[PDB]
CSV table of C-alpha atoms and ligand atoms in Angstrom, one decimal:
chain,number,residue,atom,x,y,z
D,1,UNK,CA,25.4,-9.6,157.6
D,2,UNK,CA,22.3,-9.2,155.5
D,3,UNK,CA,19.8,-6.3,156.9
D,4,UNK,CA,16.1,-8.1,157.8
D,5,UNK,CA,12.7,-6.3,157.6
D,6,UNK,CA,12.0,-4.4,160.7
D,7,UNK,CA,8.6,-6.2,161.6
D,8,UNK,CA,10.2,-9.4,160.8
D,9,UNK,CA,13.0,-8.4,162.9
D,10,UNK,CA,10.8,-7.0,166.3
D,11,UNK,CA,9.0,-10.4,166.1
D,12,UNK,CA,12.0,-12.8,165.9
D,13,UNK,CA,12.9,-10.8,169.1
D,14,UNK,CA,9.8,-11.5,171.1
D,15,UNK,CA,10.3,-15.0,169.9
D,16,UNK,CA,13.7,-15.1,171.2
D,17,UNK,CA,12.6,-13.9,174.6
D,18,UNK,CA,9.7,-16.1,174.9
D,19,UNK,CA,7.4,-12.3,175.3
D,20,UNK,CA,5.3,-14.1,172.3
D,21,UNK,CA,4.1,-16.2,175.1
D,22,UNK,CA,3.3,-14.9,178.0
D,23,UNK,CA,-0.2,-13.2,177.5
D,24,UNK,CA,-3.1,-14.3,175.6
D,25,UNK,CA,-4.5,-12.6,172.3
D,26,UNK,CA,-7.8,-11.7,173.7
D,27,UNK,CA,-6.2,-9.5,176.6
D,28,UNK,CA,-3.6,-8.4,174.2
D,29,UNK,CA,-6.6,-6.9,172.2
D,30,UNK,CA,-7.7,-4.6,175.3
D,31,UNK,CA,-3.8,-3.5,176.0
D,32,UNK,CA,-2.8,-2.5,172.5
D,33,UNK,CA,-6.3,-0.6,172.2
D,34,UNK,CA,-5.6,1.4,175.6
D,35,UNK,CA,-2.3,3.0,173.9
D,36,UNK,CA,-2.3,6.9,173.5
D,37,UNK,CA,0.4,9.4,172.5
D,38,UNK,CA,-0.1,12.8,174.5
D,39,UNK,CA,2.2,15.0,172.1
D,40,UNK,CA,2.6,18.4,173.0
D,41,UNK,CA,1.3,20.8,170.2
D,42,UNK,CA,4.0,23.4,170.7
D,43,UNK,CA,6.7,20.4,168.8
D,44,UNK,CA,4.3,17.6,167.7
D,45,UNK,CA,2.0,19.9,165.5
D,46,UNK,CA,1.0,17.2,163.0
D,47,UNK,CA,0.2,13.6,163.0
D,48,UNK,CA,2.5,13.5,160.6
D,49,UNK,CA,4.8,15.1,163.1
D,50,UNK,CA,4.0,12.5,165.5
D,51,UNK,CA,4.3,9.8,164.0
D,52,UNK,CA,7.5,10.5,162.7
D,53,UNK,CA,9.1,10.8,166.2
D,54,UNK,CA,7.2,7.4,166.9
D,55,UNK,CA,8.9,5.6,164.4
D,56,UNK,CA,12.1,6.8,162.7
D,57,UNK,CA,14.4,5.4,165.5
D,58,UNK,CA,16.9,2.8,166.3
D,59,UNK,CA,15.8,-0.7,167.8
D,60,UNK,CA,18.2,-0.5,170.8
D,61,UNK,CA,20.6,2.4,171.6
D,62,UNK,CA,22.5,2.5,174.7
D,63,UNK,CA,25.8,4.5,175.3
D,64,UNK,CA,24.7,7.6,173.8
D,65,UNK,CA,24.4,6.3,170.1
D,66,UNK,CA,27.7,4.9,171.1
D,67,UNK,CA,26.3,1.4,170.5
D,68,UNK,CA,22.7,-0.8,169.0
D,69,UNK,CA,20.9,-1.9,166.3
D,70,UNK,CA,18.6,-0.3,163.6
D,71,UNK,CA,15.1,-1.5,163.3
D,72,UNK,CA,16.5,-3.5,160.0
D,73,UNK,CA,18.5,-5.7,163.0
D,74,UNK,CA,22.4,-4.2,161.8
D,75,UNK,CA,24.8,-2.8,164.1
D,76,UNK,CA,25.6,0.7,164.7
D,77,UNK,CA,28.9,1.8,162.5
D,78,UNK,CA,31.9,2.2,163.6
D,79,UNK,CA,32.2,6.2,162.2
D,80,UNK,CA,31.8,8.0,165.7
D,81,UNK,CA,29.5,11.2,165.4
D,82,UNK,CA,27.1,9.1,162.8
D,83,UNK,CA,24.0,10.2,164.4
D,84,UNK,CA,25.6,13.3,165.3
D,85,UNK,CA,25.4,14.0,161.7
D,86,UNK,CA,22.1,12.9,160.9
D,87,UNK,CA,19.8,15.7,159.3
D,88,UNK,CA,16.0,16.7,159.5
D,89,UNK,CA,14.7,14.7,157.4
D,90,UNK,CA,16.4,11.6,157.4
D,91,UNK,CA,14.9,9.1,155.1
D,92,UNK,CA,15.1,7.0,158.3
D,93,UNK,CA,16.3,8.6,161.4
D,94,UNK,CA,15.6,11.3,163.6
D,95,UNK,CA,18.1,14.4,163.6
D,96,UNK,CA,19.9,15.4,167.4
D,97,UNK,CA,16.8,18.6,167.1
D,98,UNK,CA,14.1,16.1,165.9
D,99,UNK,CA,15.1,13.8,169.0
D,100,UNK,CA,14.9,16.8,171.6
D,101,UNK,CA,11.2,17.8,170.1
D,102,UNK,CA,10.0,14.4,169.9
D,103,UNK,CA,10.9,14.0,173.4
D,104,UNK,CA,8.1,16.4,174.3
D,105,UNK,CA,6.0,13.4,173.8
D,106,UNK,CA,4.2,11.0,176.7
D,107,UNK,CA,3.2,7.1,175.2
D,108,UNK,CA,0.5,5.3,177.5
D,109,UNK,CA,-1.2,2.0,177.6
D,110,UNK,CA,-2.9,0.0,180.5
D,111,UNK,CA,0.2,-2.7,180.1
D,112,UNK,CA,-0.5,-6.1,181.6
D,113,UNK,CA,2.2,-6.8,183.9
D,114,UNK,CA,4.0,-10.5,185.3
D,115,UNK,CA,6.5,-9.6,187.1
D,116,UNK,CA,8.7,-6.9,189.3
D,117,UNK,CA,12.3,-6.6,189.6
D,118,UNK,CA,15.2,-7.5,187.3
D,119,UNK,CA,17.3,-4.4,187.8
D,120,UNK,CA,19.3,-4.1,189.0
D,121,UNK,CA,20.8,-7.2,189.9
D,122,UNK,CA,20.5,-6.5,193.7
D,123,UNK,CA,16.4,-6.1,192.9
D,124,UNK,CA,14.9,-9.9,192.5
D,125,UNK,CA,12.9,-10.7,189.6
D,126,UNK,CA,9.3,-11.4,191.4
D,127,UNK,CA,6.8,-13.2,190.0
D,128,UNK,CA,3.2,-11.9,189.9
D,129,UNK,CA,0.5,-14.8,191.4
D,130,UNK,CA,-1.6,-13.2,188.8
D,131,UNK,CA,-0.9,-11.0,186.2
D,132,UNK,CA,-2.0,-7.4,186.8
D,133,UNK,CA,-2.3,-4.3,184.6
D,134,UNK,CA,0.0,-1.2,185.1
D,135,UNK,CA,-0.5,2.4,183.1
D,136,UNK,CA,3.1,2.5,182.0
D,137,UNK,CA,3.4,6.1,180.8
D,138,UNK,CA,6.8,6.2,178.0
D,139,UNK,CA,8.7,9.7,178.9
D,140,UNK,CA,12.3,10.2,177.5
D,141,UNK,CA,14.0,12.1,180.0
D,142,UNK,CA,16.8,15.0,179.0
D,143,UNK,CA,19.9,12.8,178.1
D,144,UNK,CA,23.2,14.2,178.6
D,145,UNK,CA,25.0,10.8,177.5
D,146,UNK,CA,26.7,12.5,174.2
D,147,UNK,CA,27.5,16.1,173.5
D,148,UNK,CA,24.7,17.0,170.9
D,149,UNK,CA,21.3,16.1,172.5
D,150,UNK,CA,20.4,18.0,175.9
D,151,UNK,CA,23.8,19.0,176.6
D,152,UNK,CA,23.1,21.7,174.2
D,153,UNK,CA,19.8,23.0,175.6
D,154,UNK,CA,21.3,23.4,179.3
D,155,UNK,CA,25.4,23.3,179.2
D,156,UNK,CA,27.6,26.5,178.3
D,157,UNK,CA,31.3,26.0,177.7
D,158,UNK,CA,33.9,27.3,175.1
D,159,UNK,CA,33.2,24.3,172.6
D,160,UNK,CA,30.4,25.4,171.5
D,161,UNK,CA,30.3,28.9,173.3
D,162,UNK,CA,26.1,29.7,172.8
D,163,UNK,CA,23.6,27.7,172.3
D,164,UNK,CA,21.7,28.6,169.0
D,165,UNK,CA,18.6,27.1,169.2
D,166,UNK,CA,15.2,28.4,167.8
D,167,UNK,CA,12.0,26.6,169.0
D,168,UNK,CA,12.8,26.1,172.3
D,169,UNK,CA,13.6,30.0,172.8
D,170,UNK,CA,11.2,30.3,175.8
D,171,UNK,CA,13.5,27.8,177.9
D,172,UNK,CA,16.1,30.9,177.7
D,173,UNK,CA,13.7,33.9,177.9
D,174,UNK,CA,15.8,36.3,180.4
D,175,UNK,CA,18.7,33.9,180.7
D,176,UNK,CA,22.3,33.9,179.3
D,177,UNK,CA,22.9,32.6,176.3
D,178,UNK,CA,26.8,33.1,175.1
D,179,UNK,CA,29.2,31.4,177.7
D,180,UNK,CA,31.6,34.4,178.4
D,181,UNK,CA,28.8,36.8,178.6
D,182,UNK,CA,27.6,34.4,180.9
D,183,UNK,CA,31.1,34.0,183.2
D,184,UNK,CA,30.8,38.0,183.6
D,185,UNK,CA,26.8,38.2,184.9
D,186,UNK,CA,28.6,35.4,187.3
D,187,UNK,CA,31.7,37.6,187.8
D,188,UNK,CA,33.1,36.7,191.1
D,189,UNK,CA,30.3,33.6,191.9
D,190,UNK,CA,29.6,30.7,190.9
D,191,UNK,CA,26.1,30.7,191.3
D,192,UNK,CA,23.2,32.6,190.7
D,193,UNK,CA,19.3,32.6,190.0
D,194,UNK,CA,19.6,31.4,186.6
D,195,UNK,CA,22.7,29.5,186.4
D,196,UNK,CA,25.7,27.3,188.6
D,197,UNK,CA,29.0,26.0,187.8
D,198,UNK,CA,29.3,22.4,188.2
D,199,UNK,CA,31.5,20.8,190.9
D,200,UNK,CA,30.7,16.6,191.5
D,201,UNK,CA,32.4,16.7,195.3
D,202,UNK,CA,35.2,19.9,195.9
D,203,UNK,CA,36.7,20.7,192.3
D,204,UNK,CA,34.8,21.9,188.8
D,205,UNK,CA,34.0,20.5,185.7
D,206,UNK,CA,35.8,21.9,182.8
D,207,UNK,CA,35.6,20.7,178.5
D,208,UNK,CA,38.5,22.0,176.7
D,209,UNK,CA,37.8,23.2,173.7
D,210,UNK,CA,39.6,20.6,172.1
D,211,UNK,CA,36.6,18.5,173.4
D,212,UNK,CA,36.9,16.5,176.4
D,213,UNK,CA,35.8,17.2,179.9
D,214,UNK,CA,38.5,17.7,183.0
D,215,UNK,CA,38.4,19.1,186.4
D,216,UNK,CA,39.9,22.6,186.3
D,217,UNK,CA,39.0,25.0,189.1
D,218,UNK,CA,36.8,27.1,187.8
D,219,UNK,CA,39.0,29.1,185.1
D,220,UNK,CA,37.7,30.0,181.7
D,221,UNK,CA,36.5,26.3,180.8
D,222,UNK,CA,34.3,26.0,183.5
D,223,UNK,CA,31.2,24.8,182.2
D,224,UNK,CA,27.7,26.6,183.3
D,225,UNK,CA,24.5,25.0,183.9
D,226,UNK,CA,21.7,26.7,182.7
D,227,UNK,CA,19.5,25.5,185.9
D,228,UNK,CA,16.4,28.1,185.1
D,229,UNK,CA,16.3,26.3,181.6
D,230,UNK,CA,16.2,22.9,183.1
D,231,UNK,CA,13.5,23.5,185.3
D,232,UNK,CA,11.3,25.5,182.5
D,233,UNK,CA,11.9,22.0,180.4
D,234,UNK,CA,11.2,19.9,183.6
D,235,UNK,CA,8.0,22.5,183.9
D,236,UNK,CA,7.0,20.8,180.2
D,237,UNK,CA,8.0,17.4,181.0
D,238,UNK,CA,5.9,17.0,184.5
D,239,UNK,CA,2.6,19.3,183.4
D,240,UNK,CA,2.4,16.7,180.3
D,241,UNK,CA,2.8,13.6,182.6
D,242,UNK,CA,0.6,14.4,185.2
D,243,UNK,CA,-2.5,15.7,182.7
D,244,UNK,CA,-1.8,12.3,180.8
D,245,UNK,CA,-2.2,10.4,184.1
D,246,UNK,CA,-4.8,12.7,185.5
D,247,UNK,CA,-6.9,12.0,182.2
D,248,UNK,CA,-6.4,8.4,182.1
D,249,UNK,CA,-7.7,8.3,185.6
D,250,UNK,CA,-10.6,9.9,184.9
D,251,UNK,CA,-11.1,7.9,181.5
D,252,UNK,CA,-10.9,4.8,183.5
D,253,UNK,CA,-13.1,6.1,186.5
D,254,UNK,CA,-10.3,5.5,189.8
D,255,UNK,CA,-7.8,7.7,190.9
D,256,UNK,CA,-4.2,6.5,190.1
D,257,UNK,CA,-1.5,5.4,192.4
D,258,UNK,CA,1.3,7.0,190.0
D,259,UNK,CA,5.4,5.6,190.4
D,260,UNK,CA,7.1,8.8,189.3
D,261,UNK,CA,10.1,7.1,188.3
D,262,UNK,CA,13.4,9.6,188.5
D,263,UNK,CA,13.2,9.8,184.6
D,264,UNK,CA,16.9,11.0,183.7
D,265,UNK,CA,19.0,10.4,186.5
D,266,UNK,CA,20.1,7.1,185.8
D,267,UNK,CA,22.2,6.5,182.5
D,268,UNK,CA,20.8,10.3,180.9
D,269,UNK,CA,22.8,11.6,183.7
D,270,UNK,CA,26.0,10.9,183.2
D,271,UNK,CA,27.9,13.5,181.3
D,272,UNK,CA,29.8,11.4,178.9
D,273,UNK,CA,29.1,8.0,180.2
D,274,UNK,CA,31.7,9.2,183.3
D,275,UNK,CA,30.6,12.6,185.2
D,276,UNK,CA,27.4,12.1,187.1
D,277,UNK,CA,25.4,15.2,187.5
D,278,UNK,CA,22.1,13.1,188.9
D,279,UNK,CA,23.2,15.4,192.2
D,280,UNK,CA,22.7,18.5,190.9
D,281,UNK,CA,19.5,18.3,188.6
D,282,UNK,CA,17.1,16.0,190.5
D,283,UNK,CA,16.3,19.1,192.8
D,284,UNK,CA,14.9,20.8,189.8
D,285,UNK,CA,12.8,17.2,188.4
D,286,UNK,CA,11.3,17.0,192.0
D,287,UNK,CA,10.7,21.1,192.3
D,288,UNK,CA,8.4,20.9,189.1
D,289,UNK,CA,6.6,18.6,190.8
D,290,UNK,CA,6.4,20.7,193.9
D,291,UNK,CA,5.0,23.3,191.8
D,292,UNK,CA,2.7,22.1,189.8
D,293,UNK,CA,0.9,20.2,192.2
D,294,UNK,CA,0.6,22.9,194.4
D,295,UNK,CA,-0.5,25.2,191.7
D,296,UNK,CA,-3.3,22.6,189.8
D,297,UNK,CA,-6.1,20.2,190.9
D,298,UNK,CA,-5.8,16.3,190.4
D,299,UNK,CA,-8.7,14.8,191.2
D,300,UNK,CA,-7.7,11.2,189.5
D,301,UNK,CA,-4.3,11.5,190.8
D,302,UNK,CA,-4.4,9.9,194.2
D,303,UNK,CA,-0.8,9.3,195.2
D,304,UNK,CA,2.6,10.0,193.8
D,305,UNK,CA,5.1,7.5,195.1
D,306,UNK,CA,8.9,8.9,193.9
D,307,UNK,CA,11.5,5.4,193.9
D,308,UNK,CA,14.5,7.1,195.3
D,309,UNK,CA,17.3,4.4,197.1
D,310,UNK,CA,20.3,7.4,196.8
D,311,UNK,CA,21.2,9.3,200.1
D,312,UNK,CA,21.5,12.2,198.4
D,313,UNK,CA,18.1,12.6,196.6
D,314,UNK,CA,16.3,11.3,199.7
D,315,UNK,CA,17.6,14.5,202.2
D,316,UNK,CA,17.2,16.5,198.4
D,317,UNK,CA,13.0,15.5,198.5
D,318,UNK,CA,12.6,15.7,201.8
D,319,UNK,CA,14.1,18.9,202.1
D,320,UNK,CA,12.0,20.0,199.0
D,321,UNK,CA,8.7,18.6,200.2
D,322,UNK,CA,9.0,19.7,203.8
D,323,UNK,CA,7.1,22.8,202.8
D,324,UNK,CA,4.2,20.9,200.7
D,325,UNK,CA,0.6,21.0,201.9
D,326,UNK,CA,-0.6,20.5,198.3
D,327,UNK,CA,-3.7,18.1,197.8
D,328,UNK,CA,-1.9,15.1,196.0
D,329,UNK,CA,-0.7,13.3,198.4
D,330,UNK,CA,3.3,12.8,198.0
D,331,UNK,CA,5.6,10.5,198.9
D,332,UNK,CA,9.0,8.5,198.5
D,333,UNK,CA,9.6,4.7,199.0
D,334,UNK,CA,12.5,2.5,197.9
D,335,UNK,CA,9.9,-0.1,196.5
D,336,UNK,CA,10.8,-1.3,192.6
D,337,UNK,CA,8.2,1.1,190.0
D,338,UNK,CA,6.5,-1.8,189.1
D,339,UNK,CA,5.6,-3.3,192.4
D,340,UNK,CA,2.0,-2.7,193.8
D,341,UNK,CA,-0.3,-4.5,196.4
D,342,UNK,CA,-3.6,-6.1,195.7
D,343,UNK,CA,-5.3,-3.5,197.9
D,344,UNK,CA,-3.3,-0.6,196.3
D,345,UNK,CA,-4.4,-3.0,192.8
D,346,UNK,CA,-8.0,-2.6,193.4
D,347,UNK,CA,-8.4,1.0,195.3
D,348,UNK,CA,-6.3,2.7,192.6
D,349,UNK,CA,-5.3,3.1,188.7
D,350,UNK,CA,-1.9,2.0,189.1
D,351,UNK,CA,0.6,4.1,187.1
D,352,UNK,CA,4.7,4.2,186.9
D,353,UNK,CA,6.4,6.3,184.7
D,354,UNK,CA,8.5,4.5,181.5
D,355,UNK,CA,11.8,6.2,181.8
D,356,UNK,CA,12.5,5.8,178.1
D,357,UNK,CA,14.5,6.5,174.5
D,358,UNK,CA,13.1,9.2,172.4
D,359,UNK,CA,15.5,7.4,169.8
D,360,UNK,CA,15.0,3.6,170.2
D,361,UNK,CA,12.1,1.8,169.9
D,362,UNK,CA,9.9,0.9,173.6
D,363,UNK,CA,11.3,-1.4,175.5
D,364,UNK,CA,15.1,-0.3,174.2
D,365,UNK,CA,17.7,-3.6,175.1
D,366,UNK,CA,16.1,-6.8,175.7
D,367,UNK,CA,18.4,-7.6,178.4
D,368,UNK,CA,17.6,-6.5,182.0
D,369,UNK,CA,20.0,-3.5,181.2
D,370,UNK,CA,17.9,-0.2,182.6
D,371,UNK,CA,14.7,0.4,183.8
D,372,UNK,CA,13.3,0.6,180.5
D,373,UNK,CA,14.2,-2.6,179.6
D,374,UNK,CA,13.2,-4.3,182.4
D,375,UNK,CA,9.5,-2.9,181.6
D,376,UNK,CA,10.4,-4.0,178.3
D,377,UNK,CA,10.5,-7.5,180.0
D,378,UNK,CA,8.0,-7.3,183.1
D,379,UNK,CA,4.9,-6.4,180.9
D,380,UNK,CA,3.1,-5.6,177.6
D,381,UNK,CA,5.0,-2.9,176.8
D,382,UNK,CA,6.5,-4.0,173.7
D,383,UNK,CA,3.6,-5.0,172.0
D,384,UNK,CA,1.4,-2.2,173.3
D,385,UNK,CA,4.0,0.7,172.5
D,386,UNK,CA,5.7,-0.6,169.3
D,387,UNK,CA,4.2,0.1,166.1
D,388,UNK,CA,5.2,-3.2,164.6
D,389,UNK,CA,2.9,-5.2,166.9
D,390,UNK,CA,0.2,-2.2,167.4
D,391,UNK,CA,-0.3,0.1,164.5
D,392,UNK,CA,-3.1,1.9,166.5
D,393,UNK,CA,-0.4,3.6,168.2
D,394,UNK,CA,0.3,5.5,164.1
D,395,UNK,CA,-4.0,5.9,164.1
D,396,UNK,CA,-5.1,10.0,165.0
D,397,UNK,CA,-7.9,8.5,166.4
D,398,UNK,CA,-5.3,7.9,169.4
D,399,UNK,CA,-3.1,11.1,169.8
D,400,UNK,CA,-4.4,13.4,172.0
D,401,UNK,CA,-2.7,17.0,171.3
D,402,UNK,CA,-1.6,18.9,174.5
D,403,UNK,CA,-1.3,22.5,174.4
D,404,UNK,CA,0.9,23.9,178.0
D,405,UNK,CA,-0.4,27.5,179.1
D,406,UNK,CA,1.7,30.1,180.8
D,407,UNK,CA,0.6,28.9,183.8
D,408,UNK,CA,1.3,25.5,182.5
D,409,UNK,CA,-2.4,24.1,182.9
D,410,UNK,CA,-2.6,21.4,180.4
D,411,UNK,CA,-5.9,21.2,177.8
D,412,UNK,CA,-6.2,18.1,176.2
D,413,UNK,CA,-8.1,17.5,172.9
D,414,UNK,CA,-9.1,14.5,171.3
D,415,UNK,CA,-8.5,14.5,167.8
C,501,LIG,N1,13.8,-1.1,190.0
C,501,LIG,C1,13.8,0.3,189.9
C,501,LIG,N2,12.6,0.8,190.2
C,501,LIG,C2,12.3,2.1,190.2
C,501,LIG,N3,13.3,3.0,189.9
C,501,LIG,C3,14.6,2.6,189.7
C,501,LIG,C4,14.8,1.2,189.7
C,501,LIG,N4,16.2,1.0,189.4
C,501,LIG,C5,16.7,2.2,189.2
C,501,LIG,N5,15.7,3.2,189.4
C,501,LIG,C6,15.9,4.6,189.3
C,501,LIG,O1,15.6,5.2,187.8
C,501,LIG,C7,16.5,6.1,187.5
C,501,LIG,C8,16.8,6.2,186.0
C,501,LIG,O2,17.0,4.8,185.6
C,501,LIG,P1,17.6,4.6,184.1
C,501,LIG,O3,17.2,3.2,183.6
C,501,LIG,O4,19.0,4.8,184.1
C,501,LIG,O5,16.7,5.7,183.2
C,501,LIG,P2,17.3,7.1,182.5
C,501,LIG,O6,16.2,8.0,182.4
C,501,LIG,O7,18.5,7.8,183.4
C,501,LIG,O8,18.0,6.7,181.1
C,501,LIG,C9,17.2,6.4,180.0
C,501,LIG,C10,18.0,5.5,179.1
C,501,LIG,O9,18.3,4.4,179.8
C,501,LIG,C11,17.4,3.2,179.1
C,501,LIG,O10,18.1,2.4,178.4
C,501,LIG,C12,16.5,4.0,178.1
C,501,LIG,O11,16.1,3.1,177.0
C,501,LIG,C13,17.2,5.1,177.8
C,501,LIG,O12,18.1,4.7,176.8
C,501,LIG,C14,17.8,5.4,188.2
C,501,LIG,O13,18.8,6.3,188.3
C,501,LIG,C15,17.2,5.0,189.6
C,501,LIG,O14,17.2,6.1,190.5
């Protein structure tokens, strides 16, 4: 198996899928110009920076790094903890660190799209009459699929007993950060302002040091969640998205019609690829929203529709939004992201949120695999976010640099 040269690689894909024909060159031209990268300045500093995290990544990563393809088109190894053990500074490759910064990074572009539906296989592929245009906006959610990404931000156990982790200091600022301090500020309860134990139904979720997750009742292996973290990161995660849409509206003159996607709760949420934890974080994606729109005018932001087709995180939001008198209006619908009416087409920018990789190229697998992917198949996305088919996205001209105040108002500059 004889590694071939990443462009040549991306475009005997989009061969292979028969992408390379559904739009036309002169639309094409519009889309791939619309792309923007809204980096936040506090990781992406540089253009350099930037376009590092936009490009020194695996074509298709699933499992956790657990298997994929490199951009070259050659298969993952068969060493375990491989990208575990990749450093800063990779010739290639982003380090565990380099993929939690260059997660703090939001990739835009007025996609044109053909279809909805595809995943999963319950949701029918539809066929748009016409194509429309969607502003898919790229966000890599936390992942807690593997051990050494986000895990390590937000999980305390007696592995690896404190976190250690300069640059994202501010997440901990008043919290715990060593595990058995942390059991003793619990003491007899296992939760608190700061922090919970897990439990996914009645008993908890343990790691023995040896590695390897069981459910113990809450003994001294009981792993913590760091929730005020969490919602600090979400805090970064949401201000980012919703300036990005907010300015895109108002660049485009309409107010947008955003799909806020549950970025994270899906395939990132499973601890492992076994223990799903979607239950107890989504309170804390949907609070940051909660907060920041009641804290922060969005003029271009008309609507934010949240897909949610769980129990759970349906009595979750609309126990959470009871409460909300914000201006933007809010609301939850079991409608696929990329699904929009020709009257919400025409009143509206329409917007979704890209629940992506920060470590595989846009668009991740080609089959309809995730939600991703199925982007990566219903629209543009692939040649407007890739660098192989759009090398604008490498181009300063189109970053914008974000800087997050204290009380998290977003200013953007151009260049
Ligand atoms: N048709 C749909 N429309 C809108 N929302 C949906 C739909 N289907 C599911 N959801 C919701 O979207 C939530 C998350 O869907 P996931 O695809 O797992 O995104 P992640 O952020 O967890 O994982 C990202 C990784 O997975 C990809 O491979 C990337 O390349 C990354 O590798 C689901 O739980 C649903 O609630």
């Amino acid at each position: 198996m004889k590694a071939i040269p990443p462009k040549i690689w991306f475009e005997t894909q989009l061969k292979g899928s028969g992408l390379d024909k559904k739009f036309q060159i002169d639309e094409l031209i519009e889309t791939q110009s619309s792309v923007r990268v809204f980096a936040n300045k506090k990781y992406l500093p540089d253009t350099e920076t930037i376009n590092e995290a936009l490009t020194k990544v695996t074509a298709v990563n699933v499992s956790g790094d657990k298997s994929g393809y490199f951009q070259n088109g050659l298969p993952f190894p068969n060493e375990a903890g491989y990208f575990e053990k990749i450093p800063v500074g990779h010739p290639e490759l982003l380090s565990p660190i380099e993929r939690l910064t260059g997660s703090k990074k939001i990739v835009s572009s007025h996609s044109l799209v053909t279809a909805s539906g595809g995943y999963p296989l319950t949701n029918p592929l539809l066929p748009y009459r016409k194509p429309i245009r969607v502003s898919i906006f790229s966000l890599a959610g936390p992942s807690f699929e593997n051990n050494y990404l986000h895990y390590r931000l937000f999980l305390l156990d007696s592995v690896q007993k404190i976190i250690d982790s300069p640059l994202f200091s501010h997440l901990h600022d008043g919290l715990p950060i060593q595990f058995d301090e942390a059991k003793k500020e619990l003491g007899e309860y296992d939760t608190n302002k700061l922090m919970a134990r897990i439990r996914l139904g009645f008993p908890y979720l343990a790691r023995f040091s040896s590695g390897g997750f069981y459910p113990s009742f809450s003994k001294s292996n009981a792993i913590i969640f760091l929730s005020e973290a969490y919602f600090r990161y979400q805090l970064e995660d949401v201000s980012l998205l919703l300036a990005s849409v907010n300015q895109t509206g108002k660049e485009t003159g309409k107010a947008a019609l955003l799909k806020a996607t549950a970025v994270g709760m899906g395939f990132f949420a499973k601890i492992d690829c076994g223990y799903d934890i979607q239950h107890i974080i989504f309170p804390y994606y949907l609070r940051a929203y909660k907060k920041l729109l009641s804290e922060h005018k969005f003029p271009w932001i008309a609507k934010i529709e949240f897909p949610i087709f769980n129990e759970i995180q349906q009595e979750q939001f609309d126990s959470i939004f009871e409460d909300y008198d914000g201006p933007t209006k809010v609301y939850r619908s079991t409608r696929d992201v990329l699904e929009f009416r020709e009257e919400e087409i025409e009143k509206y920018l329409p917007a979704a949120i890209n629940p992506s990789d920060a470590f595989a190229l846009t668009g991740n697998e080609w089959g309809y695999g995730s939600v991703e992917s199925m982007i990566g198949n219903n629209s543009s996305i692939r040649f407007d976010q890739v660098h192989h088919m759009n090398p604008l996205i490498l181009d300063p001209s189109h970053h914008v640099e974000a800087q997050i105040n204290k009380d998290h108002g977003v200013e953007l500059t151009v260049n």
